[PDB]
Design an enzyme around this catalytic site. Structure first.
Site: not given
Ligand SMILES: C[C@@H](C[C@H](C[C@@H](CCC(=O)O)C(=O)O)C(=O)O)C(=O)O
Ligand SMILES: [Zn+2]
Length: 308
Positions: A127, A72, A196, A69, A270
């Site tokens: 993202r 990040e 992430h 993503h 995370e």
């Molecule tokens: C804070 C963040 C959480 C989010 C969690 C992630 C799921 C958990 C993971 O794969 O680490 C997702 O793809 O939605 C991310 O890191 O992309 C967000 O809200 O985008």
């Molecule tokens: Zn992510």
């Protein structure tokens, strides 16, 4: 800069700067590091994975990816630091030397290059990938909803404009298919860690369903050990558990697929923080974040090394 020793690890970099770093690290460590192109992005940019190896033939390996993503930023910054750290510690640090004397490490620092470029040029919060979707004006697919594990099920969106759009079909995104092809071709990946930010969590399968994974007890105990190691440095607190219980339901995510492929030690991190700065974590926290995260990665790699 001119060498990986003059490179500033305490600041955020552009795609070009990180790609130049890859070449410098390889040139400086020709017998330890290799740059593998596993594909090209939607927009044609090369996708690179760094291979750290001290020999052997098809050695068991650890896979680590950052930046799937694009927004990040602390993850790609940490990835660059991990790359340098490996070259600095091999042969010096007893514990790490042991790890790399048996295992190979594959590290993908910028897993979503098109998105990364876009976060620098147009939208700091981008993202998704940058692919087009027939019949829609909205751009991009959520690479972490595009894997063939519970694909298209609850925990993802079918709206092309959504931040969690899963795409037309599993592996539609070349950025995802390139990794899938690599994993299948390599055939000896023992641990797969997708990094992430943010939330300060260490999670294991599954994200698409509540059923516990067969190896839940082992992965949970390993998670506790890893977050304990991480906290030892600055006291940073990480919670842990399955994706679905620790954060929320997510379908077509990376580690649910890697685990389904037989890679038992499939984890997703995370990193910092818990929301104060969120994705906009200050540069002054890059190195501390990378250092503490590395302790957790060492815990997972050592466990992997010791459980062939
Ligand atoms: C804070 C963040 C959480 C989010 C969690 C992630 C799921 C958990 C993971 O794969 O680490 C997702 O793809 O939605 C991310 O890191 O992309 C967000 O809200 O985008
Ligand atoms: Zn992510």
């Amino acid at each position: 800069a001119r060498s990986t020793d003059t490179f500033n690890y305490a600041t955020y970099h552009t795609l070009e700067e990180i790609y130049d770093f890859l070449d410098l690290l390889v040139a400086e460590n020709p017998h330890l590091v290799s740059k593998i192109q596993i594909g090209n992005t939607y927009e044609g940019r090369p996708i690179y994975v760094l291979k750290f190896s001290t020999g052997g033939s098809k050695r068991p390996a650890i896979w680590i990816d950052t930046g799937i993503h694009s927004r990040e930023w602390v993850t790609q910054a940490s990835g660059v630091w991990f790359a340098k750290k490996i070259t600095q510690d091999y042969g010096q640090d007893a514990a790490f030397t042991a790890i790399l004397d048996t295992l190979d490490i594959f590290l993908e620092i910028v897993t979503n290059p098109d998105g990364f470029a876009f976060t620098h040029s147009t939208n700091r919060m981008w993202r998704k990938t940058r692919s087009h979707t027939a019949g829609s004006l909205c751009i991009g697919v959520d690479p972490n909803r595009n894997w063939d594990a519970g694909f298209g099920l609850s925990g993802a969106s079918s709206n092309p404009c959504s931040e969690t759009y899963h795409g037309k079909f599993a592996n539609s995104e070349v950025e995802v298919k390139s990794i899938v092809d690599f994993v299948k071709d390599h055939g000896n990946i023992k641990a797969f860690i997708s990094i992430h930010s943010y939330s300060q969590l260490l999670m294991y399968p599954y994200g698409y369903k509540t059923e516990p994974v067969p190896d839940q007890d082992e992965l949970d105990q390993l998670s506790k050990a890893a977050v304990t190691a991480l906290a030892s440095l600055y006291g940073t607190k990480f919670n842990y558990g399955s994706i679905i219980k620790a954060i929320y339901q997510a379908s077509g995510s990376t580690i649910d697929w890697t685990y389904s492929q037989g890679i038992k030690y499939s984890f997703t991190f995370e990193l910092r923080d818990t929301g104060r700065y969120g994705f906009l974590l200050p540069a002054s926290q890059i190195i501390p974040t990378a250092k503490e995260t590395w302790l957790a990665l060492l815990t997972i790699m050592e466990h992997t090394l010791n459980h062939p």
